[PDB]
Design a protein around this nucleic acid. Structure first.
Lengths: 185, 167, 148
RNA sequence: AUAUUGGCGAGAGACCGAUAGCGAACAAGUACAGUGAUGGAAAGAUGAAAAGAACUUUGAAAAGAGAGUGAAAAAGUACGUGAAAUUGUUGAAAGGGAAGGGCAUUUGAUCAGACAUGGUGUUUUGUAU
RNA sequence: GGAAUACUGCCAGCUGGGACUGAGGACUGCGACGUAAGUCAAGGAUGCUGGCAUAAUGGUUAUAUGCCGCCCGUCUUGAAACACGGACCAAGGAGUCUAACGUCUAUGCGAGUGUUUGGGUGUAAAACCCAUACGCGUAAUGAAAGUGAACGUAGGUUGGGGCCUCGCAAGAGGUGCACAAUCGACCGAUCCUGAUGUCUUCGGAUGGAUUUGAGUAAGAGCAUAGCUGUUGGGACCCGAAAG
RNA sequence: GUCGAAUUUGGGUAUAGGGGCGAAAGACUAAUCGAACCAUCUAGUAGCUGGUUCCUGCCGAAGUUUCCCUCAGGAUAGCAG
RNA sequence: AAAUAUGUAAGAAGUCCUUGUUACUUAAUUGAACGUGGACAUUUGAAUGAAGAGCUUUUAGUGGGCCAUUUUUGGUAAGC
RNA sequence: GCCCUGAAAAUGGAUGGCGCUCAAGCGUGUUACCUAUACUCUACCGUCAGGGUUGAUAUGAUGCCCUGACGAGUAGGCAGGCGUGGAGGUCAGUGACGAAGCCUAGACCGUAAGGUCGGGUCGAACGGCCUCUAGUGCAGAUCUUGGUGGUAGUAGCAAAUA
RNA sequence: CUAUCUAGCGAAACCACAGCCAAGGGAACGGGCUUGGCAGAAUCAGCGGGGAAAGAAGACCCUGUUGAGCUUGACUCUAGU
RNA sequence: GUGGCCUAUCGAUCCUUUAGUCCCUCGGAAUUUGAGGCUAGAGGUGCCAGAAAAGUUACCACAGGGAUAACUGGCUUGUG
């Protein structure tokens, strides 16, 4: 027999083959897996592993984050990339001429960018403009902003937001939340 | 319809095999077998009969004769693993066996239309046997009892243990 | 649907995925939130702290319309202006033509200072505001006028 | 304006399809039980059309064998098809206080498939088969 | 004194016989012998010959033989059980539907989203179009009055995929999203300090605090569908004595 | 055993379900009585028993902690997917 | 006073040198803590192995246990 | 040290049995030998991981191919699939020259769920593929309804004079 | 008078499959398993050892956070007075 | 030096009550009583993570239990 140290036939635990049926996504995959296979660049592999992701892990990105990123040094003329969607943000008023590439663009974001002289682009054009990932800059958006995470790990002395519907007085502001009613936490 | 289709009909153009690496090297006969040797046949029409060995043919077979005047065995071709090489030795030198070869023994295979309901020889083969057996019996007469030793047959008796016998 | 339920895969397997030993019976721990001060005490103390007790002061005949005080941080404040005239009012960052903003007509009762509007003057109509937001406006050169 | 499992009248269905669907697809709130309140069933299909078997014969008669109608009586009012348990007859096989099963093989019975092909070729007829 | 032999051990020494298998399917490579040509036992078997070409091999089935084989389902530490149910056949028959929800996943849109209460319209319970509200979300915290989120490149440090530069590469350096840990800043609550001032009792600037929050710190949600799971409902099916 | 009486009995009539009647046994009350029968609430509840319908593949347990008018059961952590 | 079991360490987040902040601390730039800059690279600091490491969510069943080797308690002992 | 006495139980009786006595017993040792689903080698299936391959012309990139390791399993979890009633679509599908159903120690495919064919009976509708949907798959429940058995041509059909 | 045999008629309980024993082990008392012994069709009348024969989800005991009847200076109420 | 030299000597929601701030509300606007609230303790649940609680059934019943008794059988052999 064998003295098995590890588990047998255990999946990688990772994801391949985005299990959506979006044929266009599968085309992009058919392309970028080729590029990863043959270009020996890591950018392609990153993009590929990002295309496989779910929606909570394909979060949105704001032009404000983009402008933060471009306010870096030696990063203005760079080309931005987002494996996801791109939202607008009234919280700013200036925006540079920079080009961008991503799956989806909201009407507001696209209007803002082009109004700034830039261009909103698809990853298939990105590949032919920059196969190896020349002069690029990847961004991925925040995950721990979701409202579900607040409830993740809820115990005592954590600060972790019970799962609840109705908020107000007489909904969990009592025994176990203040000293005068028994105890706190 | 009844059954829809396959996505992909496999090809039919057969792939050729690979260049093998099994040549043919000639047969390494055992040591006990030398021309002029007396043999025993263990199977065939002529099983149990003692016979002579003359030639090693090209298709890993052996040329053989009774001779025919003795036991009714003609010129023939047999297999080395279906006989025994006795210790008995006789001379065969002065025999023009070089004529014979595999084509000499051509069956001229029978078709399928020719099925026998219920049920011939080549004079060339006959006279060739007649040519060789005379040269051989002239040597057999030299040593004693040998004509009889060939005319007789071989068999086992209660107590004959081949692994302890010596031929 | 049904044909993707695992009840279709439990056919033949006896217990339908509920156990031979524990035997899916009806209501073995109670019905509902029973046992909160008892055998479900740990669940309540751990995941729902504060479920037991009353706290404060009661409000008979509470109408949720005195408390209608929706907010509007200064971050936005221009969404209220259509983009048609927004860039005009921006690049014409000038006195004597300052744009007026009726938040109340938009459904916003209070004004708050999240941060950093530009240095253009504005005129704000509003019910309530806060100290910081007003400071930032009048620093940008605008003004606040209150209404009811 | 709203409600409406009752009543009357109409129309539709990703419903059920005679152990289902209302308890009831039929003389069903019927037969039947019970002192009584009450309870409460089972039961569909010959065939296009009865053309539902004239007539002969055995038998006391029922019925049977023939005959005949019929596309079909392997559709005969015990009637569409007509399963299984269970049973009978025939045929095969085995059989010492069980039988049955698995691996392997003998014996008996029984059974599928490949056997053309291209092809030198005209020894050829129907002259190109 | 001189040897042999055994015992143990080694050979990239030779040699004979026997058994099982022959996978793969143009070449490609490693190598030997060769002067070379080329050949080779070198990245998986080819050659020669015979018989039959049919129930002969084979399959199925019944029987015989050799060996093994306890009757299933179930509760159980433990069942072939001297533990329960089961004579046999057919048909029926048992985790569903919904309101509200969680996680995860696909889809549309995206700081917004949701047409379908309702109106218009119609090839008429369909499909198509739509206004205004409303819900959820974008702001929390406090019992409540009520207040209400940038000192700064929306911070600093550490580490970080990736990119840029130099470099043949090695590697070095710059930037460094997400994310993790951490010190700070900000909003509210609590406890303090209590300026200009003042209806002289109101107001609450400024600065703090081993305090505290389901918080901000360039928004991420809304809706539909799906498995799974939760609660209520007859609630996987049958089952009480009872009231 | 009793057999001219506290006798036996027919018919008519009264008493109805927490109620009747009882020479009293918890007996009888339409083969039903330590609370009838019928229908409904009602598919009453059940930590308890029994059963829980097709294949293959892959992974693979626990009977242990703490609390519970808890000890035939649940929540919790662990084990597992 | 053993044996067996047991905790920690065996480096880059380290060592060393220098000098910057502070409302803490000191008699005192004296220290403490965090820092800037600089040197120390494959023998980077013991061996072996690593089958990928780390992290999160969510949910099932279970929560009657039993046997043996050894240590051991009650009991005369027990398939207690 | 072996053997003996000690040493007595109940159906008949068990070194496993026969049986064994310089053993087929006891103690010990040297070799050979037997055989397990274990080990080694090879093939085949599957899973997992790592990889190669868009180039036109050909089919299928969730495809084809290469390499290596591994495979036990109750409760339980996940996945890929077979089948049933019905819907939307398509095959200008089959069909009285015989649909479906049923029988078939007759054949074929598939690991299997199951599918297809031939023969027979019968007489009117039915299916394959892509999707949807559910009152969806039974060996059981002292299950329900109906039917049929072994027991079994058995028990027994005997009070009231005939 | 039956039983018995015959003519006629003709059920039921029960039934996993069934039907030889010893010992062993085993859920500690097997018809099946293991080792042994044995074993020759089909049966009739009787018998009452066995099949832990059947009969009825043990009516004793225990548990149940299931009941009911009865009692009482239990708890909470109440008609009446 | 924040109770006893150390290790034990004690107690939730709700309700009541008291102390503090003299703070908030009584929702058409005010004043004063009164009530409600915030913060901190006390009144106690010893079945001590906390129900408000007497018996009997030889008239009994239901669900179940060999998880559990009364016979046998079995291991054991104290006692006999």
């Amino acid at each position: 027999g064998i003295d098995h140290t590890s588990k047998q036939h255990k999946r990688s635990g990772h994801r391949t083959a985005p299990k959506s049926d979006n044929v266009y996504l599968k085309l992009l995959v058919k392309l970028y897996t080729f590029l990863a296979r043959r270009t020996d660049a890591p950018f392609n592999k990153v993009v590929l592993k990002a295309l496989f992701l779910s929606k909570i892990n394909r979060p949105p990105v704001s032009v404000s984050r983009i402008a933060r990123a471009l306010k870096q040094e030696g990063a203005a003329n760079k080309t931005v990339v987002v494996v996801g969607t791109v939202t607008d943000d009234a919280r700013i008023f200036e925006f540079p001429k920079t080009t961008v590439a991503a799956l989806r663009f909201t009407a507001g974001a696209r209007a803002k960018i082009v109004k700034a002289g830039g261009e909103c682009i698809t990853l298939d054009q990105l590949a032919v403009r920059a196969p190896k990932g020349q002069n690029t800059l990847i961004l991925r958006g925040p995950r721990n902003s979701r409202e579900a995470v607040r409830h993740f790990g809820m115990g005592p002395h954590k600060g972790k937001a019970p799962r609840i519907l109705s908020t107000g007085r007489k909904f969990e502001r009592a025994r176990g939340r203040r000293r005068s009613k028994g105890f706190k936490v | 319809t009844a059954q829809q289709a396959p996505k992909w009909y496999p090809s039919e153009d057969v792939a050729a095999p690979k260049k093998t690496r099994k040549a043919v090297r000639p047969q390494k006969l055992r040591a006990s077998l030398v021309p002029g040797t007396v043999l025993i046949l263990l199977a065939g029409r002529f099983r149990g009969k003692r016979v002579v060995y003359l030639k090693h043919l090209e298709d890993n077979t052996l040329l053989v004769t009774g001779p025919f005047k003795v036991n009714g065995v003609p010129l023939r071709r047999v297999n080395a693993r279906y006989v025994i090489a006795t210790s008995t030795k006789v001379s065969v030198e002065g025999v023009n066996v070089e004529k014979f070869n595999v084509e000499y023994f051509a069956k001229e295979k029978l078709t399928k239309k020719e099925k026998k309901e219920a049920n011939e020889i080549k004079t060339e083969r006959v006279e060739d046997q007649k040519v060789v057996d005379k040269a051989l019996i002239a040597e057999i007469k030299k040593t004693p009892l040998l004509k009889q030793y060939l005319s007789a047959s071989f068999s086992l008796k209660n107590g004959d243990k081949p692994h302890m016998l010596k031929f | 649907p049904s044909r993707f339920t695992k009840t279709r895969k439990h056919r033949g397997h006896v217990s339908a995925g509920k156990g031979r030993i524990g035997k899916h019976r009806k209501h073995p721990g109670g019905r509902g939130m029973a046992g909160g001060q008892h055998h479900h005490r740990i669940n309540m103390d751990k995941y729902h702290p504060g479920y037991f007790g009353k706290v404060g002061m009661r409000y008979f005949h509470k109408q949720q319309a005195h408390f209608w005080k929706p907010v509007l941080n200064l971050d936005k404040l221009w969404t209220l202006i259509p983009e048609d005239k927004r860039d005009q009012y921006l690049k014409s960052a000038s006195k004597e033509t300052a744009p007026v903003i009726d938040t109340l007509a938009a459904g916003y009762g209070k004004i708050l200072g999240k941060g950093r509007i530009p240095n253009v003057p504005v005129i704000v109509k509003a019910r309530f505001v806060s100290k910081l937001a007003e400071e930032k406006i009048r620093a940008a050169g605008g003004v606040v006028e209150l209404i009811a």
